[PDB]
Symmetry: C4
């Protein structure tokens, strides 16, 4: 079930707070938030690879603002370069996802999609893949803000952090 | 069970004409038309996306008629630029499809193929994917009609518009 | 079963010779020959489409004979241009495949693999794709022979026949 | 079900030393080493094919050593061209896989991944693929030795030897 989906070999039940017995009814929101934050962070980590490999959409993001796709910085100042008529489009389409299509109020996590559209019939398979989504969500949560404090402390995006050899601590 | 396949969440069963509680014996063919109109219109919306993105087949469609693939229009007049010996090859091959291979008299829908060649083996996610085929079919039937109406109103294709900025009526 | 696997809708059980009850014991090899011929002719049709689309390997087939891959004719004289030490390698590898690995004396064609490595557990779906393999094999058997006689009766490969606009029969054609 | 996983056609059970009932106790490790040596060699003959086809990573492996990916030899001396600060990075990461992530302590060879993520539930489906992993692992062990031996007995790598037409055993 859902409360043994977070455990793994090298830590087990890692509750250093002791909140699994302190707030036992609040686990199912907190699991749904940890899964939600992980799913955003894994898309954010992979997004930082693709931005900093200079893979661009080869066109104009806003011809009214004269803003090409390669006119947008890859690092922290990338979302700030998007015009406010474009951030209105992101918040409108993802209001229809987060409220109607795949509502974040649904704490189950499963939507109609499966794992690549596939329901996993074997319960030790499915719980294993559920553990990977949490663990790769946990590694990317700390990973994505290891990448944002590597830029708000240096003032240097992840491309020329590697070009100038500035990964020396 | 074909009677609850069209009914999705936000509107439920939707019958402003009341023809489910009207004639019940005409539903099996009206479902067969709605699914068939959906499948034709979904391949047409993808067709308008590929044609307006200037993805062509790199050659001559009719070297006797001196027609390159890049000479065919990408709007509603693209099908009328095809030579009459080319429209008949479309007509006679899809006579073999519509009458023999995937016979349109089969009001069931399932000819031989499934979801990428397989049954889904599971009455809840198969009914979920049957809901998606109808709902994405319904959104594309309005989508291809809206693509053709503003084609003939503006007189432009979907690449000429988005080059002039015609986004407000 | 195997006796029900070749029959589909517009013809059903189709034998003008009537050997399904004249020779009922010779059927299970004759199915395996039809399936083998179909499997061979399906790769031969896809091969002719690939050769005449000028998809070549970018190199030298035999640098000893100065023979590039693009120097090989894309028609019925393709393997007549392969050097004889090259056809020895093809015959030696498919001796290992047609006798040891996937032996052709196994008269059900069921060697190790499934349909893309999948065993189709549904018997009505497995019989459907077994019918497709036979029917696409029967269509490619007529497809490869009508491709081969159209080349030798025109003297042109399939690229040159569609370059000259020679689809119309100078001889006499028969096609769907 | 591990004593019949290497048994295939013509050889069947093959044991010229007779260790299968000289040591029926040490088979569980000895299978796990054969599977591990098979998996390492299978990713090695594929490596020699990729390197000798000049598929490189179009950049600098070590800009500190001023060394790009196309400067490394594509033969047996390619591991020596890597700087030791970089090859320390790969034994630091494969220490994490061989001890922690997929521990080679586990004599099954079985970890959370299956065959392309799927568990094969038909039992000679699964035993057919387990036989294939062993057999292609065994053929790659004899393949990666026959590549490294025939390189040093001609001095050329596999790209160099095939370009010179040095396939037939003239000097040997
Ligand atoms: C998005 C935030 C978030 C939330 C809500 C959770 C929630 C949970 N974690 Mg998870 N965890 C997270 C991120 C999160 N985690 C990250 C990023 C890692 C990698 C370090 C982990 C590593 C981890 C392990 C190994 C395990 C859990 C477990 C749990 C469950 C324990 C129940 C409980 O109440 O624990 C206490 C409550 C919390 C852990 C969440 C409270 C969030 C605090 C208040 C945030 C405080 C700010 C923080 C210090 C800032 C750090 C960022 C900075 C380093 C840059 C609970 C569902 C256990 C489990 O799932 O067992 C079934 C378990 O074994 N977590
Ligand atoms: C490490 C990568 C990874 C892995 C192994 C998984 C694994 C999974 N995802 Mg997750 N996911 C990930 C990253 C990952 N995810 C990322 C980065 C995102 C953001 C794009 C998501 C967004 C996502 C959504 C929106 C959903 C999943 C769901 C699932 C689960 C499907 C299992 C199932 O058959 O449900 C049971 C099957 C059914 C109920 C019927 C469907 C057939 C499976 C555990 C599904 C779920 O509900 O999760 C628990 C689901 O809806 N994932
Ligand atoms: C998720 C794991 C993770 C990994 C692999 C890294 C990796 C790195 N960090 Mg980061 N970091 C992380 C998370 C991570 N970080 C987190 C969670 C924090 C706290 C928010 C930091 C805070 C941090 C700072 C302040 C700095 C690094 C720096 C570095 C680089 C140091 C390289 C070295 O040789 O020493 C290296 C790329 C250094 C750097 O920025 O190099 C460019 C550096 O100055 N890290
Ligand atoms: C090919 C056209 C077509 C047909 C034959 C059907 C048939 C059906 N739909 Mg409908 N549907 C369609 C297109 C179609 N749909 C489109 C484009 C949408 C998106 C707007 C929908 C949205 C929809 C929902 C949400 C639901 C249905 C449902 C149904 C079924 C219930 C019976 C019924 O309502 O009869 C009434 C008759 C009809 C629906 C079609 C008759 C033809 C009309 C009278 C022609 C009028 C069109 C007008 C002249 C031009 C259109 C204007 C403009 C859009 C261009 C029936 C099988 C219900 C269902 O499946 O329950 C299980 C259901 O819940 N449909
Ligand atoms: C490779 C040769 C070959 C062989 C050995 C078979 C064998 C079979 N076919 Mg198949 N068939 C083939 C090719 C072949 N077929 C081709 C190319 C087509 C498409 C035209 C078909 C269309 C077909 C259908 C629709 C059906 C069969 C069926 C059968 C089975 C019925 C048993 C019987 O009495 O058949 C009769 C015996 C033979 C067919 C083998 C005799 C070979 C002849 C005498 C060789 C002479 C041909 C001649 C030179 C062709 C010249 C023209 C050509 C170059 C264009 C048997 C396994 C039936 C079935 O599977 O039911 C269980 C069935 O319904 N066949
Ligand atoms: C498998 C299906 C198939 C298809 C799609 C074709 C298609 C074709 N054939 Mg081929 N053919 C086939 C099988 C096929 N053939 C078989 C099984 C044979 C006997 C081995 C032939 C023997 C053949 C000859 C001898 C010729 C063709 C020719 C042609 C071309 C023109 C046909 C025409 O317009 O004549 C009119 C159609 C009819 C009179 C029948 C209606 C056309 C590309 C001709 C060609 O290549 O043009 C130069 C040509 O000369 N075919
Ligand atoms: C809504 C929908 O329909 O979805 C459907 C369809 C779909 C998409 C096909 C399905 C799927 C499968 C999916 C989504 C598979 C993808 C999963 C994903 C995206 C997994 C990333 C993990 C990243 C990690 C662990 C990073 C650690 C980060 C670390 C260790 C760092 O140090 C961060 C880093 O920055 C620094 C700090 C330092 C740099 O020197 C190094 C880098 C740059 C790394 C679904 C989900 O099943 C259902
Ligand atoms: C994961 C999942 O869901 O399962 C999947 C996988 C699975 C099971 C396989 C399924 C299937 C069915 C599939 C994929 C069927 C595809 C069939 C296919 C691909 C059929 C090609 C015909 C091309 C021909 C006959 C060429 C004719 C000949 C031609 C065009 C010519 O000779 C002319 C030409 O050549 C020259 C002479 C000169 C050139 O300059 C120009 C051209 C090229 C014009 C599913 C159900 O779909 C889904
Ligand atoms: C025959 C056969 O063998 O099939 C086999 C093999 C095969 C193919 C592998 C299998 C599969 C899977 C398939 C077919 C998956 C494909 C599904 C498909 C093709 C789904 C499109 C949806 C489009 C929508 C909802 C558009 C809305 C359009 C809207 C909302 C618009 O506004 C229209 C638009 O123009 C305007 C008006 C304004 C623009 O600003 C926006 C655009 C441009 C959009 C099968 C089916 O299982 C079995
Ligand atoms: C965690 C992220 C990460 C960073 C940020 C990072 C950085 C550098 N890598 Mg490392 N690396 C991995 C991860 C990371 N590496 C992983 C997962 C593996 C496979 C297990 C791996 C393998 C090698 C090899 C073979 C070499 C190598 C090198 C460098 C060097 C390049 C700059 C330079 O050399 O001027 C910089 C410091 C080369 C080298 O160290 O040359 C002296 C080299 O030859 N890496
Ligand atoms: C079975 C093999 C086969 C051959 C050998 C063949 C050959 C030619 N096709 Mg055809 N074709 C199909 C199959 C075959 N075609 C199929 C299955 C379809 C869709 C269902 C199809 C569609 C179209 C369309 C839309 C057009 C078309 C054309 C030509 C013409 C080149 C022009 C020329 O030589 O003058 C040559 C002879 C164009 C045309 O007819 O121009 C007057 C044209 O517009 N085709």
């Amino acid at each position: 079930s859902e409360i043994e989906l977070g455990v793994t070999e090298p830590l087990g039940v890692y509750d250093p707070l002791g909140w699994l017995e302190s707030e036992p009814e609040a686990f199912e929101r907190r699991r749904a938030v940890e899964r939600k934050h992980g799913r955003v962070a894994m898309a954010a980590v992979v997004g930082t690879i693709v931005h900093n490999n200079h893979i661009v959409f080869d066109g104009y993001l806003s011809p009214s603002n004269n803003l090409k796709f390669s006119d947008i910085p890859t690092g922290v100042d990338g979302i700030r370069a998007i015009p406010t008529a474009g951030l209105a489009q992101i918040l409108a389409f993802f209001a229809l996802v987060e409220l109607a299509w795949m509502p974040a109020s649904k704490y189950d996590g499963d939507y109609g999609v499966g794992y690549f559209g596939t329901d996993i019939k074997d319960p030790e398979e499915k719980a294993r893949k559920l553990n990977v989504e949490l663990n790769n969500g946990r590694a990317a949560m700390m990973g994505i803000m290891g990448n944002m404090v590597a830029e708000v402390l240096t003032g240097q995006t992840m491309y020329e952090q590697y070009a100038s050899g500035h990964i020396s601590p």
